[PDB]
Design an enzyme around this catalytic site. Sequence first.
Site, PDB file in Angstrom:
ATOM      1  N   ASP A  36      39.354  42.044  50.126  1.00  0.00           N
ATOM      2  CA  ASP A  36      39.809  41.589  48.975  1.00  0.00           C
ATOM      3  C   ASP A  36      38.678  40.228  48.274  1.00  0.00           C
ATOM      4  O   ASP A  36      39.567  38.846  49.152  1.00  0.00           O
ATOM      5  CB  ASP A  36      41.125  41.280  48.986  1.00  0.00           C
ATOM      6  N   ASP A  89      33.866  40.627  43.392  1.00  0.00           N
ATOM      7  CA  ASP A  89      35.565  40.891  44.140  1.00  0.00           C
ATOM      8  C   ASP A  89      36.272  42.421  44.058  1.00  0.00           C
ATOM      9  O   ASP A  89      35.803  43.307  43.531  1.00  0.00           O
ATOM     10  CB  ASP A  89      36.205  41.166  42.509  1.00  0.00           C
TER      11      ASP A  89
HETATM   12  C1  5QU Z   1      43.696  37.705  40.118  1.00  0.00           C
HETATM   13  C2  5QU Z   1      44.726  38.570  39.886  1.00  0.00           C
HETATM   14  N1  5QU Z   1      45.490  38.906  39.027  1.00  0.00           N
HETATM   15  O1  5QU Z   1      46.117  40.076  38.258  1.00  0.00           O
HETATM   16  C3  5QU Z   1      45.988  40.372  39.262  1.00  0.00           C
HETATM   17  C4  5QU Z   1      46.909  41.650  39.023  1.00  0.00           C
HETATM   18  C5  5QU Z   1      45.100  40.177  40.142  1.00  0.00           C
HETATM   19  C6  5QU Z   1      44.492  40.822  41.708  1.00  0.00           C
HETATM   20  C7  5QU Z   1      44.999  39.792  42.345  1.00  0.00           C
HETATM   21  C8  5QU Z   1      44.413  40.698  44.021  1.00  0.00           C
HETATM   22  C9  5QU Z   1      45.481  41.906  44.246  1.00  0.00           C
HETATM   23  C10 5QU Z   1      44.502  43.202  44.539  1.00  0.00           C
HETATM   24  C11 5QU Z   1      45.421  44.218  44.393  1.00  0.00           C
HETATM   25  C12 5QU Z   1      45.121  45.750  43.924  1.00  0.00           C
HETATM   26  C13 5QU Z   1      45.140  46.706  43.322  1.00  0.00           C
HETATM   27  N2  5QU Z   1      44.857  47.293  43.238  1.00  0.00           N
HETATM   28  C14 5QU Z   1      43.018  47.983  43.601  1.00  0.00           C
HETATM   29  N3  5QU Z   1      42.661  47.004  44.298  1.00  0.00           N
HETATM   30  C15 5QU Z   1      43.391  46.550  44.607  1.00  0.00           C
HETATM   31  C16 5QU Z   1      46.766  44.393  44.479  1.00  0.00           C
HETATM   32  F1  5QU Z   1      47.770  45.933  45.272  1.00  0.00           F
HETATM   33  C17 5QU Z   1      47.644  43.282  45.097  1.00  0.00           C
HETATM   34  C18 5QU Z   1      46.311  41.687  44.554  1.00  0.00           C
HETATM   35  F2  5QU Z   1      47.466  40.592  44.887  1.00  0.00           F
HETATM   36  N4  5QU Z   1      43.205  40.989  44.010  1.00  0.00           N
HETATM   37  C19 5QU Z   1      42.088  40.633  43.802  1.00  0.00           C
HETATM   38  N5  5QU Z   1      40.682  40.273  43.600  1.00  0.00           N
HETATM   39  S1  5QU Z   1      43.260  41.187  41.937  1.00  0.00           S
END
Ligand code: 5QU
EC number: 3.4.23.46
Length: 359
Positions: free
Chosen positions: A34, A218
């Site tokens: 991430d 991202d």
């Molecule tokens: C900031 C923020 N505000 O709302 C959300 C949903 C976020 C994400 C936080 C984090 C995150 C991503 C995923 C994921 C899901 N699906 C696909 N890829 C990653 C996850 F499962 C858990 C997470 F903790 N990574 C970020 N870049 S965005």
Amino acid sequence: FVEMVDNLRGKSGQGYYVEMTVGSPPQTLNILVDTGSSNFAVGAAPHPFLHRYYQRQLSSTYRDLRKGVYVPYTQGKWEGELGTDLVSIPHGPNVTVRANIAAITESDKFFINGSNWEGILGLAYAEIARPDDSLEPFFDSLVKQTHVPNLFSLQLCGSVGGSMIIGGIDHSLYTGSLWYTPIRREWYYEVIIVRVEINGQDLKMDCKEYNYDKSIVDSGTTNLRLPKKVFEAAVKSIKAASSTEKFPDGFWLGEQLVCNIFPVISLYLMGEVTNQSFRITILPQQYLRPVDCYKFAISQSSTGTVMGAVIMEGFYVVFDRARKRIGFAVSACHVHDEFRTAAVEGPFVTLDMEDCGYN
Ligand SMILES: Cc1noc(C)c1[C@@H]1C[C@@H](c2cc(-c3cncnc3)c(F)cc2F)N[C@@H](N)S1
């Protein structure tokens, strides 16, 4: 870097993960890659969704920091206990570092039911690390403690696979030349978009709108997120370019699914030189994602532009932290057809690029 090739795995829309070991003896865990966060946080309790979790009791090299951390999201939440331990990446550099690790003890809508990862590797900067910037992110610790160069690169391929090259660039993973855009500020991987084109046609918008209130790269976001004012202008242009077939309004808003007509999207990024830019071009194969049922993977945003997996899967992306720049090159694994391919092209002349950034 041959051993680092194909070290990423995952499921469609569930993110990309890398294998890591934590503690002594080494405990193997799959960790979400991430670039949109800065915490190294791992499941440390038997949550039903988890294949495995960090067991601090079995680690002789675990050290307690005696501090808690609460991280709420717009769409989730995790809470953990802060500590340090020895961390290694089996299919990465042959090194072991002492890194900060948040032992996740409580969470909601954080872990995915059916996913194969049980932690998150925040690769961004200390400024957005929680609770504050004193908690050193993993990559900062890795570079300080070893001779690993302050650079990593990602090739995300569209269940899914990819490569995280730590400490270098693998030239076999891309075609053509790398083109670099400056990292505006070291918090997120913030960049500046100076021009947006749909099928070569300029949106004719104030470029400050494209970066309101920021534009970031991202890997932890699936979609290309755009500011609403930019999104509605972009969607209106996509609607006009795909006027051959009619689509419900819910589809464009990501409220419903749909079962050459679709235009290409070009983003011009700030270059390394004054008045110089370059463009990156994506295809329908990137923003129309399978779920045949497809979901429109472009959504409105309140936090600014997010160049997620939609953008990154078309390109080999170099996070050159040492030179405060991000490189883009056509990915050797990107999904395309015989008529159109993803492209990185330059140089272009673009004036007043500094006015595109929001203050
Ligand atoms: C900031 C923020 N505000 O709302 C959300 C949903 C976020 C994400 C936080 C984090 C995150 C991503 C995923 C994921 C899901 N699906 C696909 N890829 C990653 C996850 F499962 C858990 C997470 F903790 N990574 C970020 N870049 S965005």
